[PDB]
Amino acid sequence: PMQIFVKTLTGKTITLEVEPSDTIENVKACIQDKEGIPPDQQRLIFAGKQLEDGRTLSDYNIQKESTLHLVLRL
């Protein structure tokens, strides 16, 4: 049980409470449910990289109070 912050370009803070063994696609689906962005325009950025679908959060060593970024594509 950990909490992370997803922050957009306009400036927000979505506090997602997740677990290390979750899939990135599920996180994107939850962001869709909570904000309305379709789960295909999102491009999550962590530590100056691009997160990929099909993996888990524990692979990238995501921990408590780690801030991600949500950059949309058109």
Added chain:
Amino acid sequence: MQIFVKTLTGKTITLEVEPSDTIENVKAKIQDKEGIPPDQQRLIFAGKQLEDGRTLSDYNIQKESTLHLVLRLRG
């Protein structure tokens, strides 16, 4: 100083506690007496979620008081 902790269905557990005791000690005692890890225990007193980092005296919790235990598992 033997506060009662009630689970969801019907169970009530007595727990001896000192006045200046943190929430972590209470959670550890509950783990010892019941088995639930001190990571998935969420204690609720009156109508407030007991934050970790304080003592029962701050929340005006006294003898013969009742606390509620709810598990943090679903989503």
Added chain:
Amino acid sequence: SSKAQQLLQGLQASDESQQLQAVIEMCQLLVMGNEETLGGFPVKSVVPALITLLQMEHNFDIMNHACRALTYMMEALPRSSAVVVDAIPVFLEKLQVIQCIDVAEQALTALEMLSRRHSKAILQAGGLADCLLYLEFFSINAQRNALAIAANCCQSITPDEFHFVADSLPLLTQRLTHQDKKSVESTCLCFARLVDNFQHEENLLQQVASKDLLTNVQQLLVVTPPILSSGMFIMVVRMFSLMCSNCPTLAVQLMKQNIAETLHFLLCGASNIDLVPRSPQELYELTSLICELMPCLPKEGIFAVDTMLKDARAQLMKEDPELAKSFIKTLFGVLYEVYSSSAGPAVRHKCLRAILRIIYFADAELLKDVLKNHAVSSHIASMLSSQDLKIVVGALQMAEILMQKLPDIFSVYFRREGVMHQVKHLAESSNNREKIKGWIKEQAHKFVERYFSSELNVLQRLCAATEQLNLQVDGGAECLVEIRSIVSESDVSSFEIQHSGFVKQLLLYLTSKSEKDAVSREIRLKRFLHVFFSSPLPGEEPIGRVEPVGNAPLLALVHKMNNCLSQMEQFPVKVHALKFFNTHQLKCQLQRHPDCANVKQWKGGPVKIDPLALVQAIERYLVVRGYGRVEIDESLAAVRHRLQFYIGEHLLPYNMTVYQAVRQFSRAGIWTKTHTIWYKPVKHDELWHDGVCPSVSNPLEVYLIPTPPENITFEDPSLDVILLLRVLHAISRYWYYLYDNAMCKEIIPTSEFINSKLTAKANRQLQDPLVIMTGNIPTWLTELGKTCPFFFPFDTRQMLFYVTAFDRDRAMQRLLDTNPEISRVAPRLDRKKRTVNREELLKQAESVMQDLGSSRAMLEIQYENEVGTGLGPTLEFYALVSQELQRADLGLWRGEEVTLSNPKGSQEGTKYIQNLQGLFALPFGRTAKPAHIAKVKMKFRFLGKLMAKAIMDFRLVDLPLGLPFYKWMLRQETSLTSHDLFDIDPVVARSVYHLEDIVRQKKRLEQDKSQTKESLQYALETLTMNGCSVEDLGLDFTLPGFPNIELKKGGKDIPVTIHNLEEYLRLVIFWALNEGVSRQFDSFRDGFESVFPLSHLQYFYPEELDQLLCGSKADTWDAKTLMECCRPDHGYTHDSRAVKFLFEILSSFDNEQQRLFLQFVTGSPRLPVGGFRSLNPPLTIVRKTFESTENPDDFLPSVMTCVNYLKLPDYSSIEIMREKLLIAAREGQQSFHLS
């Protein structure tokens, strides 16, 4: 921009540290950028500097960022790939000689990202060999990217340029047998594209295929479970078909390499005909390959018309024919089975062509011993009488070939199964159509003149039997036994039943009532039920109960009628676009209606008209534009109707699409011509006083009609058989209403009326996206679904209901959920969110259903102090409200008071209503206070609205209702008898039955005229029931069990006597089933119709609504069904230990732990119809990630209920798993604290 110039100046420098800092900064700026944010980024200057920086040798770290910068630039701005594509030589040079593996991997990633749009440059750059020269040294991802580059380069290739792949083909061929999915997929794509591009060059095809590719792909296609997916299976099979068609030598080579075994395995299954279910495209591709492996037909003779409807294999056949004989013997059976069990214009035609070539190129003996356990004459006769002028020609050619090859065998079959008759019909009764008509006429005339020109104990016998069923002439019972003998033990055909009028005569025999008939209808029906089935003869009813056993002759007649209907039917199935519909939009013109002119006159011209838009959008646009006033304003937009639209004399409903509005009331013209729409602003109470009840209706009398029902419009040659089957099913369902004493049992269960061809045609029609998206379902399908629903199974009717009862968005969602295989369809639905509290759930649920109960948008329910939202809490809302609606305090249903198992903190001690046959409403008399009645009525209205809303949103409820409840729902409350009291009150039914055992004796004894008044009185007073007389019972006119409900006025001082007992029984039944439960069901009907009408529930029977509303029936699981839909991944690959323990431990519950587990994981204590295999997200099992200190033993499992994601620790024992999977399911319920 401003920082971009500084970064560019940093790139153009000398100090190495400056370059490193600048490139890191540039990569960081590019990662978080976007098309709008990074506008004006200099790509004409940054790119050349980055390339010059990459062209180095002294560092192994700056390059890993120089490549990343270009990769991210292509990713962010998808238009920089016009200046970015200049260092293909540099990337290829780095690939040629290797120094750092990571640099090579990044170069591969950059090339893969670039190849999506520029592959020709890479192809002329020589990258195909360079990428694969060191293919065995990289990791998995680099290999996948290299194979993707190879595929994208081989997509666009030319015959002149072949040396780029000429030396690399063996590497891919040897790579075709790997155990990695994606590498195999990419290599197969490369081969398919190469074969497609080189299709007109036989030498190049022989170079590509050789002799090892065929072998490798042959064992690739057979391995199970399939490495390939469905689409790639289709692509590979199409590669085979194209290769065999374009060059016969490889067709011969595959025919000499036992390809027949592979085709047989793919079609039927195993090597020990139950065909494996496959999609229509796969079957079409396999049939095309089978057809192509066969020699082609001659272009002269009777095949000259095929030029208007629009070698090496022959040499091998002239050679050793053992191979060809084995091929034909192996494949004819599966070909015929596929042909006779598929409904599609393409599969059928391909199978037909294959059958023609097989028959033409075979000899006498091979056809003799292949066409033995088959029925070909019936198929030819059925397909002759068809509207399409392709199948007719094919059938004529088959008939000619079969007559020429086997005259003796196929000379009695054609006469017995009506082929000569149809050929004579065709031969007696803007240029191509006339020419093919003339060819058909001449060919049929020649066939008749040659083979059947100059010319039986079954047809004459059937005619003699059917001439004795005439209404004007008495027939006794010999005609029926003759018909039974002919049907049960003979070799009668479907054509003989047509020729000798049997179905029409039997229909008139069973369903006629006039004054010129020589025998009444009742005696005829009883004679029929005595001959078929074993009911007593008229006037000879035994004293006991009519409970016959035998039902075989009726089943035989039903089967023969179904076979005849399948043989004769000619219904059309329309399947076939999406890009056109999603691209082009409709055009409309608005003109004011001349009769009334108050609003402003339209002058804009064309109107924005989306194909799937509703007329509500047009009304809103007109109101906002200001035409509704008798600048853009939102006050009017922010229900009451002020404007209305008309087209001709037909009113336009508000819930109708513009496409349908144009198509129906007002084709190429729909999308080309302009349309116009007009706009304009908008009693003595006998029951209580005398004691008389309404008569019981007999449902069979409305089915027994000779003429078709008013709902039937279509014209087909099999209407009579449909009507006869309808009558027979009505008789089977309702036969105890004709006898005074009988047992309520169906003669034949309704599952034995299913037709095997109409179901296939319906299922095929319910798969085309375009018809579901537009709403062009053929009339016959809906009409048969509403009039004769016994032909189709439950799933077909459920899908038809969901497609034709609601809007297009829900239909598309249902189609996507049911068929995950699939110019792309994309539903768009609205969502409304509401917050509730778990302390006043009923009141807030009532408020929610009053506000948004009837809206046309999905509803999602969230809670106050919780962070969970989605599809879990929404299902839990219904699962809890349904449980709340069963409380004993409300006082609504019958039954006993029990206490729930495993309750919450406050739920303990609450009484709940339990009944072991279902829930039925309590009776209310004529003395009930208005407050109680109003409360019950509002509760029932809320319940009805709740169920109506739950059905529309694809949710499930948890309310165990009863059969009389659904009979009331379907408007069948006027046909309820004493049989139904066993479903409401077991103990009253026995008393009613024992009392009805006395009225029959009383009537029989009074019917004897050889007695006197005193003798009659003594005999009537002497009648006793279990030692006590009706006077000794001492009852009254109060409904039993409830001593406050009066059957009629003064029912306290009126004791029941032998003289008035029938009235007492009838009043008891009426007050228990219809009277006291009327006001409580009228409110339910009013509430239900507030969402969508009840008339859309006519596809179901009263015993099928439970599965529609609630879940499936309870069943005990086992490892076999669990290890076929559960998908374990992320640490628990199949055949692990935790998965084994879990699969063993679920299949040991008692349905209470099953309910607990289902509620804990899914959120609802029920499963969709079909069990685990019907859950759209399969239950996924993953390994929980722990640390090195805490044991992964004293923890608890977790679940994401939105996607059925179960996180499970690796326990060290099964007892620990048992003791820690129950704590989670019991003490971890009713909470969403982690989302």
